[PDB]
């Protein structure tokens, strides 16, 4: 009945959204660390190839390694630019909008949770409207519902309750008086009228919206109304709901091209054609025929297989033990870490300098 | 008097915190972009030095340039590692905790704002308790108070209302009945008792806390109490307030050593001693005497001035016009952008390869 406490069909879907919004910061940390980590992997590969080229100066393989190093360095550069120009704002914005909406929802749910007269009469009722519910563990009436911002550790967030279409559990409610409101539970937050609701000497002067505009509490003796938010459109009195849905839908993750390895032909890999054109052909434009001919000299072919073959050569190359530690691996493929590989490259670039004086 | 609407002395300090929390996501975007941008500046400098060394193979200056390139590459590597391992979590955590607390506060303030009976009687009163206040522009009773998550553009956040000590405006209130509560305004949210408050047929079964535990609304006919939060300690029923204060206090910004240039002597600059030891001395340990002697050969000295001198040499070096565009600058110091400089380095590394075959 109108102006009574809320049975679980009303608040459980809000609990479900609040718990899923709690994971948006986790996914933001996950994506920012993954972007940085993939950039580091691209740079390690560039550094390994660069070291291979510095050691093996002259050979066709060294020139192949120079093309390989350029490719991965560009990938590392472009991923860092994507992190600055796109991912940072995406992930800050999703963290902010989701956490803001979660605070809006949580404050409302926490108010319902506390506003009760007894074990059987209050604003937050169980499924059957027999008893008021209580929060214990991280659950309310059996429903996960911590009403708090849990510790942030990286994790991909679910899209069970907030996804591409909207808030899938926040559908139109055609009979709030029977499905949302109990028959007997007293709850002055269910109405703006003075007899049973928030009004004191008369009704509130207007309807009141709560949970960032999700629920509308009329100042008459009528049941609440809720927004249908399962089929959202870019737009409101419920703007924080739109903002969080839009921010989450916009996320790409650290999975765009800059962070992904290229496995097709060599001439099409990032940086290759340009480097071949200017460094080897001394031309500015080329047809792929001339590029592939040039690649055959250095890769013995032009497909991904010949690329992998050169990468395997790079991975097996040993470096001087004094450059890594008293016993550490010395093959490039067994070394990782940008700064470590950087200092190794510097040693060999210095040796290359010395050989040039002598020669 | 107890159980009356709240005059502005109560809610204005909450408005001030909410407006400042709104800037925490801005500062998170600011710091993440600044970290990436400074890393790019370190890498541009490394690439410029590397190009200088590839072109000028042989000379003492080229060896100085190799040491300079190693230094900036290490700075770029270490800043990216700091962004992955420290800054990402710091800025996600500050964004999440501040935005969550802001939603908790904003939902409560928005509830007070709407819960009124008339222009003179309601939960949110002006300074004198003459009229209820209204939100227009982004202000309530003259106080900036948007009650919304504003668009996120980079900006350093103020620490006026949330700082190292705590929430400086949220001090102990010794006379809430006269300073927070009006004398006449009706407000069922000011009390848990049934005559004038949230209770319907009897009092609420317990005191109720609102705004993430900031205000305590007793189920008796007494004035509210508020947390004193101006002198905070790492710990609560008001945990979201502690979380946001701790997350903001932990921020370092993109200003730690990895993102700052080093201006003292050369032997102490990142990477220098190690590179000199292994590449030039072929020793594992050295006294600074031997290092400085070696630096004199290549920098004509060992202070920051000789370092700047080599950097100026690098900045003036021209590259081939066909590597940058039909008319673009061709001196290294006038070029910027990691990927662009990367492709230039590759061209010259390829030329170095060719010279080694011939030699």
């Amino acid at each position, epitope marked *: 009945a109108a102006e009574k406490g809320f049975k679980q069909a009303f608040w459980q879907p809000l609990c479900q959204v609040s718990e899923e919004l709690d994971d948006q910061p986790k996914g933001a940390l996950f994506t920012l660390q993954a972007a940085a980590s993939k950039i580091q992997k691209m740079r390690d590969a560039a550094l390994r190839a660069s070291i291979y080229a510095e*050691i093996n100066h002259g050979t066709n393989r060294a020139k192949a390694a120079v093309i390989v190093a350029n490719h991965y360095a560009m990938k590392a550069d472009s991923g860092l630019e994507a992190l600055k120009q796109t991912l940072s704002s995406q992930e800050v914005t999703a963290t902010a909008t989701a956490s803001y909406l979660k605070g809006r929802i949580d404050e409302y749910l926490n108010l319902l949770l506390q506003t009760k007269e007894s074990g059987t009469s209050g604003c937050m009722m169980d499924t059957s409207g027999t008893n008021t519910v209580t929060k214990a563990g991280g659950t309310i009436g059996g429903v996960p519902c911590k009403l708090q911002l849990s510790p942030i550790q990286p994790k991909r967030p679910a899209a069970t309750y907030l996804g591409k279409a909207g808030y899938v559990g926040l559908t139109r409610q055609a009979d709030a008086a029977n499905n949302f409101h109990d028959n007997d539970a007293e709850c002055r937050l269910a109405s703006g009228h003075n007899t049973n609701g928030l009004g004191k000497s008369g009704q509130l002067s207007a309807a009141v919206t709560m949970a960032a505009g999700y629920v509308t509490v009329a100042n008459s003796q009528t049941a609440v109304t809720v927004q249908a938010l399962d089929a959202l459109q870019e737009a409101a009195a419920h703007q924080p709901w739109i903002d969080a849905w839009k921010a989450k839908k916009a996320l790409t993750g650290a999975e765009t091209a800059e962070f992904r390895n290229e496995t097709a032909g060599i001439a099409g890999k990032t940086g290759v054609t340009k480097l071949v054109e200017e460094a080897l052909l001394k031309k500015k434009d080329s047809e792929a025929s001339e590029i592939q001919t040039e690649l055959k000299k250095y890769f013995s072919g032009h497909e991904n297989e010949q690329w992998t073959a050169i990468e395997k050569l790079i991975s097996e190359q*040993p*470096v*001087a*033990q*004094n450059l890594v530690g008293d016993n550490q691996p*010395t093959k490039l493929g067994e070394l990782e870490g940008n700064a470590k590989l950087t200092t190794i490259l510097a040693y*060999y670039r210095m*040796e290359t300098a*010395g*050989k040039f004086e*002598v020669l | 008097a107890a159980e009356k609407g709240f005059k502005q002395a109560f809610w204005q300090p909450l408005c001030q915190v909410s407006e400042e929390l709104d800037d925490q996501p801005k500062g998170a975007l600011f710091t993440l972009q600044a970290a990436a941008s400074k890393i790019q500046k370190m890498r541009d400098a490394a690439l410029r030095a590397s190009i200088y060394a590839e072109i000028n193979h042989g000379t003492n200056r080229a060896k100085a340039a190799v040491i300079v390139a190693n230094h900036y590459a290490m700075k770029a590597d270490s800043g990216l590692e700091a962004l992955k391992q420290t800054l990402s979590s710091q800025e996600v955590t500050a964004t999440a905790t501040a935005s969550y607390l802001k939603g908790r506060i904003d939902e409560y303030l928005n509830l007070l704002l709407q819960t009124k009976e008339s222009g003179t009687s309601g939960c949110m009163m002006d300074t004198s308790g003459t009229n209820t206040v209204t939100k227009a522009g982004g202000t309530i009773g003259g106080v900036p108070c948007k009650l919304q998550l504003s668009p996120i553009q980079p900006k350093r956040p103020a620490a006026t209302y949330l700082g190292k000590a705590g929430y400086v405006g949220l001090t102990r209130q010794a006379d809430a009945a006269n300073n927070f509560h009006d004398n006449d305004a009706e407000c069922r949210l000011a009390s848990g008792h049934n005559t004038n408050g949230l209770g319907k047929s009897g009092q609420l079964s317990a005191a109720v806390t609102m705004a993430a535990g900031y205000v305590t609304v007793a189920n008796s006919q007494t004035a509210v109490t508020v947390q004193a939060l101006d002198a905070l300690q790492e710990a609560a029923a008001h945990q979201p307030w502690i979380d946001a204060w701790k997350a903001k206090k932990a921020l370092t910004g993109a200003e730690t050593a990895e993102f700052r240039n080093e201006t003292a002597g050369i032997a102490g600059k990142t990477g220098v001693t190690k590179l000199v030891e292994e590449a030039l*001395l*072929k020793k*594992k340990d050295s006294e600074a005497s031997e290092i400085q002697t070696e630096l004199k050969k290549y920098f004509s000295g060992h202070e920051n001035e000789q370092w700047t001198a080599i950097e100026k040499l690098i900045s003036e070096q021209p590259v081939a016009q066909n590597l940058v565009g039909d008319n673009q600058p061709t001196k290294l110091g006038e070029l910027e952008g990691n990927a662009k400089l990367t492709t230039i380095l590759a061209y010259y590394r390829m030329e170095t390869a060719g010279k080694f075959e011939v030699l």
Partner: nanobody
Amino acid sequence: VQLQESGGGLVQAGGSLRLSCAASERTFSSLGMGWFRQGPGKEREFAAAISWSGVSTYYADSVKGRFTISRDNDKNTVYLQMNSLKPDDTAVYYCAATSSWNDMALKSAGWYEYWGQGTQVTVSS
């Protein structure tokens, strides 16, 4: 680049042996070459080295005047002539190559990227 030594084995005290180390590629002529020896129970130690250009040679004090290192770029091979052997010369002898052209690299194992598998030399009294 792969190094294979040969010419080890048993020898009586006062006898002589010539160790050979052939590299698998003409790259050899850009490598400084060295010989290191690891006695039973002991740590591995420098014996002899020759600069990439063959212009300079270096010897541990325990083998100076007895051992001679030389190189033949045409055969991609470095040699260690070992005269007047004594039981204390018993060891696994490793050939090694360094990409450095700095002679200071030659005297410490840690500057050599390439290593042979080592050959046993056993001198009985």
